[PDB]
Amino acid sequence: SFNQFVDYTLQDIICEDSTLILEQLAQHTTESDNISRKYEISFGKIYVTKPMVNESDGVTHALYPQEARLRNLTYSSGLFVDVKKRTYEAIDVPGRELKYELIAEESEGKVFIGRLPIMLRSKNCYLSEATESDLYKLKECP
C-alpha cells in the first residue's frame, strides 16, 4: 500500500491543484497605467530523496533506521517539486475581452516542500536493497 502511494499517489495529488493564478486587473487610474498582469505558479514533477536528517549545525547526512531509533529522530526523506513561474500581461482596452500574452518571463528549479516519513523495508528505504549480510552490518534483524 505504501509503495503505491509513494510511487503514484504523490504525483497525482500535486497534479490536481498545481496551478495558482493571480489576476491583476487594469486598475484604471490614468492612461499611462492600463496594463493588466497575470502571475501563474505551476507544479511539475515531484522527486523523493533517500532517508536523511539535518542536524542543528546544518549538516545533512544519510539516516539509517538504527541511528533514528537511538537518536530519537524521525525516519523520513525529502520531497522536491519542479516549479514553473509564468507571468502574463496584456493591454486592457476598456470594454473589451483581454488576450493575455506571455511576456518572456518563464522561470524554471527544485523547491523543498517538507519531509515524508518512510516505511521500513519499502522501495524508498535503505533496507530494501540490503542482503542478509548487509542487514547484519547495519545492526538490523533479518
Binding site: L20, I21, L22, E23, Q24, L25, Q27
Partner: peptide, 9 residues
C-alpha cells in the same frame, strides 16, 4: 471599484 486582486480557477 474592485479588490485589485483576485484568483481565477
Amino acid at each position: 471599484l474592485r479588490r485589485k486582486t483576485r484568483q481565477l480557477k
